[PDB]
Design a protein around this ligand. Structure first.
Ligand SMILES: O=c1ccn([C@@H]2O[C@H](COP(=O)(O)OP(=O)(O)O)[C@@H](O)[C@H]2O)c(=O)[nH]1
Ligand SMILES: O=c1ccn([C@@H]2O[C@H](COP(=O)(O)OP(=O)(O)O)[C@@H](O)[C@H]2O)c(=O)[nH]1
Ligand SMILES: O=c1ccn([C@@H]2O[C@H](COP(=O)(O)OP(=O)(O)O)[C@@H](O)[C@H]2O)c(=O)[nH]1
Ligand SMILES: [Mn+2]
Ligand SMILES: [Mn+2]
Ligand SMILES: [Mn+2]
Lengths: 628, 628, 628
């Protein structure tokens, strides 16, 4: 018992009372033939009826064996369940193809007075490519699973002193909640030493009514640091800065302020970090906050040849565990059993070892976007891999219709993408053509969609990149206001609350089906080009031709009109997109001029950016933008 | 009652407590409309709720009528169930198309005090092509099925004295368990007279802690015989040798050491043997140990025209009875109602009559593979057919991803295949071209997959075959070490624990979809041939181009690379396959030279092998390799 | 209450205790959401749980409205249910497309002490093309349906005195049972006045042990008449003969001896007959005895243009009410809502009014087959239509794999088909070419399948037809033995118990998939013709090339072989079909010669057959073959 608690890797957890049935599929998967639902008295125990089966082949309770095999020193894991009643524990593993293999099974008989203990040691040898381990319970009489867990065969190396960092910006209510959920589970609280909150917002988290109660439970492990708005980069950079200077914490764990939490997720990541073969970044997955049974992604990489972040080779976005169980014979579920290798983890949950952060230094001053990838790629170049752990997750806001890469962020995508590209493009010379051809495609689509402001702000992006690193650092704060100033000009960047704020449409909308037939995309594009050569009628800038819903607003519909309203992706307003031939060819020329500049000057940008990294990632340099 | 027990063919059995629901579909098939699961107090009884239906149209409890009709003297079978409660027994049969026919039905009323007995005599006449008989129970009040069985209308001929043979090699734990499960059911124990265990391993089954307890229950019906490693052939040959010389047992039942058991399976095979029209080999099916609701195969044959073991005409591998019930209108289930005729049964469970083994003599000294087929084909030539009984099964390890025919065994497949081919090729002359063309295909695929060691050891196989029978017998022990010595050379035959033991791959893996389009297999093969003509870059033998998962590693992916790691089929390690043009054309020439030798010298091999059979299958000759 | 019982059309009936769940779908259709199965205390009552729904949109309990509208004088029907508990009766109708229409609904509250009565009058007006009426029950508290029925709004015209006729031939056990099930329901017993059993068999129904008990319940309403074997024609002719001469029964109801019964079926047919607009034949459907949820057919017609009995225009054989409910949105179920018009009903249950049988006279002396159609077609020509009532059924043996039109019956099909054709071909002259072209197709298929005996006995059929009516009558008894004498010659007509009675096949059977591709049926037929021109190898008449299963034995497989065993359609034996070119061309010539004879002499056969009808259907003439 002394040694048990210090080798626990991940617990068997159940859902809270009154949790939606969709979300319960993350925890336990019950047979539709059982007479009654299973009951979860506490988050660690479960009551099962007589003559019933429940399967723990689930996102939260199954053991992601291949990952432990690959990155940790654990030769084998031990399942321990403590149960009363008569029944059977069946242990299964999978091959990386998803094929389920029955390992061993134990019949038990237990009473509340002499509770039955069931231990099974599963060797991690057969998980080179992938595979999970899990268990089912099948009952003779009624059964209570009092506790269950996956264990290593020796204590966890090192000490567990975690600096939790949570940068906040005008989301006090959410942040106060994140601080509240850290102290929920005693086993997390115990291993938290410091909690850094860089408050970059004008509506402060200290001012909240529920804060004192939340802050009291943390004691003086909590500090709040007021600084200017420096985005993600500045937020997390501050956390690193603090944890390395003002705490002696062995781990730095980046988190977001708008996250729901499964506290065992934190403990699982810590487990892997401590058991790692070599020092490494360890991150958690994100479940979708707005569709909570859905896993966002198993892991991301940066695709060379266009230098663009993307899904890892054998992983698809948005995996609904309620519709596609871990153990189903469907093709989406079969990919989950592969071991996914990432280039970086997102900063919703990402643990960085102390003397690794010290070595890599700070993040790049990118404001938002790409800061996290850069860090992953940088650590990789120093021999510190990143592992995105399955089964260890927080719930975060996804791009569940809500977001887009056409607004002000479109600047920060492109700009930072190039910055990071110069930083890590250790490859062939002629390769940069692939990224610029990549952008030309994007830029033609934008214009075809009448998203003019986007192109403009993207042309500022390429200008700002070409001015170098010294310049990027000085516009950490100034850049955001500058994007907005540019965007005010364009009717397509000015949100209006309703389309009824404008004169009713000339034409009622018609259902125009998505062309995915080769003959039809050829013709719909020809119509697009030719119309786009005619002089735009200005009557259509005063009265929109259509009231376009977000969903229906693609290249093929917008290339025929001169003016139309398009609903913002959140569905909170509309922009009045208005075609103009003169303004478009201008933007198109400026875009062409910048793309030619890029392939001409990229060799040069690699040299000057790589050289400037000790500065850009220095604590000393970040001091002059972080402290008043 | 005196006469009942001695005419019992197969009992109605239920699952153990806490058996997975998947596996219970082997026993009883319940209506999703029943209010509650059915309960199995004992392995022979079942409790059903009021207003409920359960169907015994299942692998274990249905009667494989066509088989009994074909091979046994039974004109009709009698169902006997003993039941309490009010309900109805409905008896069904099938045609060989799967079409279900209702035969008769009996309403019963029984109490525990005056239990109701229900007998139905089903005539076996209408089962020429195939068909099963089974029964359902449908309840008015709650019902208990106290016992149920299929009976012949007269006593079983002969006496039941079974020599059970279990050859073991370094699997003490498993073997001790097999000996334990034989004495489980009293009705099996009663008919076991001897249990021979040839222990060819250096980790002895006697040394096990649980052995004394297991051996005590057998008394002195158990002997253990220490001998050198002589593979399957030597193991089972020893069992035959012992049972014919040192026991007066009427039957010899071959078993494996790594098998879970349904004891009634043993009794069913014995039943058929005793009721046989003429003396015959009777075998049991294998269920998959690692996917326990799945039946491996209904029966195997040796396909003339390539002389290669294969699925019997109307049977497909891997039949999941949980997904495809015996009585479903699906195409996979419809094949189960045909009567499958085999050429041989596997030696997991195969019963050989005493004066049949005496007549046929020993097995061929093949070490592993084909020993069993040869025996089936040999018995066939003497007028002793083999029947693979459905419903009579043990659970055994299948090729559930775990195994492959590319490693050291690839020698023993080819070699023994040819040995056996010479032995039983009573057919046309020019026919041998079909086997050699068969091998040329295989050999080109191997090389294309960079599996060089395979070809090498297969070329030893053809050399060893051509040296004749006298020579094959002397290399019974020496051959295995010799294969390994040859395999050490090739990087593709040397297993390494992880791919991270090697330098990281040059390219990340890309999803390349299986080409089954005629235009695409033509082009993907053209790329294969042409690249395979270019000089291999040696930088790719020092740093692998890919980290290939087993599943993704086929001809079309491996024919483009010069070097890559491929994960072993168990998923326990990786080999570094490395292309070389010079070494390949060498192997290809040596393979071509041997194939030309075969068709030249096969007439000659038939003559010299057939002539040498009295020697190869002699007890006297096997003495000089079995006894120190 | 006085007037209720004499206007009852059909009762709401439930299944017996322990009836299979498949068959219960004929009676009531329960929601999978109900907490418990519904219970049927008695065959007329049903107990439903609280908060549950059951739908009586079922074969047995729904009202076939369109039929009642079309053929009876009933302007409207009345549903009456007597219920306790709180709940709601919902009444629905359908359009002939299957579209369900909600009519009205009644909330009830009843107690056992003051039981609630619910009456709904549904007008039959909107059922021109088809449509059903039914009701569902939906419960608040637990509900008991004590009784339910469909009623006319006035008493039944006429008196109900039914002569039940059951011809038996060597099936004593079955016949004794039919007599037992007539006296089961008191409401059937009451309306049965006589039961005629012509016993044409040598194993007499009187000799049975269970007969005296069965005969006692009938009193002296039962007579048994010994006569020679004169087949169906002679059996039923005898029943007519008796009921018209020796009873004063108002109805004659033909039945079979191998039928399970729903007694309300008898009452429903009687109901319609009594309520008929004009005098008419009224028949019941047949449910499949061996697949009891399956309806054989909604109704049959005689297809002019080939003069061949067939499914009525919008009806398909074999409708499984368990898989396709009356009220499902599937295409098979949608045809059930059309009103099917028949040309005749089968003699399993067919009611003939007294002064209609008197007018039409006896059946034709056809021995078996077509006797029933002829009678339907004859009655039609006199203005007496036939109606096949849905919901009124007996269970009878179908052609559920068991039967075929290639054996001795093949004579009686063709012969009688032509007899009947001459009798009723009131159409165009050149039309007979269509029947003879029809036969040429059949005859070429037979020969291609090596079914030589068939063609031979069919050529006797055409000879016997051409000899005229006077001759057909004299061979009523002699013809059956004569067919057998001819069949003894041919190896394909001699059944052997197993294929193992013959030398094992030269080739093992190969799976040859059904060609339904235009290119492939063209080639598979070309192979057929050309091989069929080569001289047959006689070694293949001594050792069969294959062991062909019934299912796999079609034109495309048999046209390539010279000799093979084919399993009888019951699966009880095999015939050795053996190709011969000399014997085949002979049969083919004799067939061609007869077909030329037919179209030459059909005008002549119409004249001589039609003229001979008063004789063939005379009671006086049938006397000389029915009485010793
Ligand atoms: O003007 C800004 C925009 C965002 N952020 C920070 O950048 C991170 C990511 O931004 P956001 O949450 O709005 O985008 P999301 O994560 O939802 O995609 C957050 O931690 C914010 O604190 C910031 O400091 N200032
Ligand atoms: O080096 C060996 C390899 C195997 N065997 C025997 O050969 C049989 C089949 O081998 P194995 O079980 O390893 O293969 P599998 O049956 O799983 O395919 C077993 O009964 C072993 O006892 C042996 O005696 N020596
Ligand atoms: O040799 C025969 C053959 C049959 N029948 C009668 O013909 C009818 C139909 O024959 P069967 O029942 O054998 O054929 P099925 O109705 O099953 O198709 C039955 O009522 C039999 O009594 C007969 O009298 N003598
Ligand atoms: Mn966020
Ligand atoms: Mn084995
Ligand atoms: Mn019949």
């Amino acid at each position: 018992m002394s040694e048990l608690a210090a080798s626990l890797l991940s617990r068997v957890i159940l859902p809270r009372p009154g949790e939606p049935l969709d979300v319960r599929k993350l925890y336990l998967e019950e047979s539709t033939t059982n007479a009654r639902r299973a009951h979860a008295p506490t988050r660690t125990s479960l009551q099962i009826g007589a003559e019933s089966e429940v399967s723990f082949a689930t996102y939260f309770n199954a053991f992601p064996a291949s990952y432990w095999r690959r990155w940790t020193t654990c030769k084998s894991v031990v399942l321990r369940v403590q149960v009363t009643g008569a029944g059977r524990v069946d242990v299964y593993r999978t091959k990386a193809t998803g094929a389920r293999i029955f390992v061993e099974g134990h019949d038990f008989t237990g009473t509340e007075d002499q509770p039955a203990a069931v231990e099974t040691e599963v060797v991690l040898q057969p998980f080179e490519d992938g595979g999970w381990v899990w268990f089912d319970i099948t009952t003779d009489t009624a059964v209570t699973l009092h506790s269950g867990g996956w264990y290593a065969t020796s204590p966890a190396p090192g000490t567990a002193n975690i600096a939790v960092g949570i940068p906040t910006f005008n989301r006090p209510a959410d942040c106060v909640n994140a601080l509240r959920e850290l102290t929920a589970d005693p086993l997390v609280d115990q291993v938290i030493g410091a909690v850094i909150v860089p408050d970059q917002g004008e509506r402060k988290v200290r001012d909240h009514p529920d804060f004192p109660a939340a802050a009291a439970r943390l004691g003086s492990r909590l500090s709040i640091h007021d600084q200017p708005n420096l985005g993600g980069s500045g937020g997390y950079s501050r956390v690193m800065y603090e944890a390395l200077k003002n705490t002696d914490c062995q781990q730095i764990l980046f988190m977001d302020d708008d996250i729901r939490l499964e506290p065992d997720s934190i403990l699982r990541v810590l487990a892997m970090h401590r058991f790692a073969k070599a020092p490494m970044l360890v991150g958690g997955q994100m479940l979708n906050l707005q569709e909570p049974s859905h896993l966002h992604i198993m892991g991301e990489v940066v695709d060379r040849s266009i230098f663009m972040w993307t899904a890892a080779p054998h992983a698809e976005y948005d995996h609904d565990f309620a519709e596609y169980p871990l153990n189903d014979n469907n093709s989406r579920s079969k990919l989950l059993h592969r071991r996914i290798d990432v280039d970086y983890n997102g900063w919703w949950t990402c643990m960085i070892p102390r003397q690794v952060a010290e070595e890599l230094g700070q993040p790049l001053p990118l404001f938002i976007k790409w800061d996290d990838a850069d860090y992953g790629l940088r650590a990789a170049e120093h021999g510190y891999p990143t592992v995105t752990l399955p089964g260890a997750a927080i719930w975060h806001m996804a791009w569940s219709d809500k977001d887009d890469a056409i607004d002000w962020q479109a600047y920060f995508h492109l700009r930072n993408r190039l910055v990071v590209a110069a930083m890590h493009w250790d490859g062939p010379k002629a390769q940069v053509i692939g990224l610029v051809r990549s952008h030309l495609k994007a830029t033609l689509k934008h214009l075809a969609c009448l998203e003019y402001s986007t192109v403009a702000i993207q042309n500022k992006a390429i200008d700002d990149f070409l001015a170098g690193p010294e310049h990027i650092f000085s516009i950490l704060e100034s850049a955001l206001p500058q994007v907005h100033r540019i965007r005010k000009s364009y009717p397509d960047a000015v949100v209006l609350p309703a389309a009824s704020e404008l004169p009713p449409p000339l034409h009622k909308n018609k259902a125009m089906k998505p062309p995915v037939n080769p003959l039809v995309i050829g013709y719909r594009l020809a119509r697009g080009i030719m119309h786009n050569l005619t002089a735009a009628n200005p009557q259509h800038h005063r009265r929109p031709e259509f009231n376009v819903p977000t969903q229906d607003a693609r290249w093929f519909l917008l290339c025929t009109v001169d003016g139309a309203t398009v609903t913002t992706a959140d569905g909170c307003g509309v922009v009045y997109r208005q075609r103009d031939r003169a303004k478009m060819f201008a933007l198109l020329w400026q875009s062409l001029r910048r793309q030619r500049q890029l392939l001409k000057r990229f060799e040069e940008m690699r040299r000057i950016y790589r050289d400037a990294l000790p500065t850009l990632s220095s604590k000393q340099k970040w001091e002059t933008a972080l402290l008043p």
